[PDB]
Amino acid sequence: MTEYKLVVVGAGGVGKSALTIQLIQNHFVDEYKPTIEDSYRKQVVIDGETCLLDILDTAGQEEYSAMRDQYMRTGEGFLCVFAINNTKSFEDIHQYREQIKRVKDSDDVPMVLVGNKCDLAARTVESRQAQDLARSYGIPYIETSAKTRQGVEDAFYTLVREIRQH
Numbered sequence: 001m002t003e004y005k006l007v008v009v010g011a012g013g014v015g016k017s018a019l020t021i022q023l024i025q026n027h028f029v030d031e032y033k034p035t036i037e038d039s040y041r042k043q044v045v046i047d048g049e050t051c052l053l054d055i056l057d058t059a060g061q062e063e064y065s066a067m068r069d070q071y072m073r074t075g076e077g078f079l080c081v082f083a084i085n086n087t088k089s090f091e092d093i094h095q096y097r098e099q100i101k102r103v104k105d106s107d108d109v110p111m112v113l114v115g116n117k118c119d120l121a122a123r124t125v126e127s128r129q130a131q132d133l134a135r136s137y138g139i140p141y142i143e144t145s146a147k148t149r150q151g152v153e154d155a156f157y158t159l160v161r162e163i164r165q166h
C-alpha cells in the first residue's frame with residue numbers, strides 16, 4: 001500500500017506528541033514528557049485508500065536541530081504546529097517553515113498550519129491572524145485540541161490529501 005511520511009514540527013510544548021497520540025491511541029496525554037524523536041506507524045483507510053501513516057514526531061528543543069533536519073529531509077508532508085495561548089510559538093512558525101523549504105529545496109511543500117490547544121479560554125493568537133498567515137503561505141489552517149479531539153483527524157487527513165494533489 002501507499003505510505004505517507006508525515007512530519008510533525010513546531011516549538012516545545014505546543015502539543016505535537018499529544019496530537020499524534022490522540023490520533024494513534026485515542027487518549028490525551030497530560031504528562032510532561034519532552035520528545036527527542038519518536039516514530040509511529042498506523043494502517044488507515046482515508047477516502048477508501050488503504051495507506052500507512054509513518055509519522056515522525058520531532059523535538060521542539062533547539063539542541064536537536066541537526067537531528068530535526070535529517071528527518072525533515074525525508075518527509076512528504078509537514079504539520080507545523082503552534083499553540084493558541086503562546087504567541088512566541090506562533091512567531092516561531094516562520095522559522096520552521098523556512099527551514100523546511102531549505103532542507104526540501106522547495107518553495108511549495110505539502111503542509112498544514114495547525115493552531116492547537118483550542119479548548120483553552122486564554123487565547124493570545126487570534127484565528128484571524130493565523131488564517132492570514134496560512135493564506136500568505138498558500139496552505140490550509142486547522143484549529144485543534146488534543147484534549148477534546150477537535151480537528152485531529154482533520155489536520156492529519158488534510159495533509160494526506162495535500163500530498164495526493166502535489
Ligand SMILES: Nc1nc2c(ncn2[C@@H]2O[C@H](COP(=O)(O)OP(=O)(O)NP(=O)(O)O)[C@@H](O)[C@H]2O)c(=O)[nH]1
Pocket residue numbers: 010011012013014015016017018019029030031032033034035036058059060061116117118119120144145146147148
Ligand atoms: N489543554 C490542552 N493541553 C495540551 C493540548 N495538547 C497538548 N497539551 C499539553 O501541553 C503539554 C505539552 O504537550 P506535548 O504533546 O508534550 O508537546 P510537544 O509539542 O510534543 N513538546 P516537545 O517539543 O518537548 O516534544 C502537555 O502538558 C500536554 O498535556 C491541548 O490540545 N489542550
Ligand SMILES: [Mg+2]
Pocket residue numbers: 016017018033034035057058059060
Ligand atoms: Mg513531543
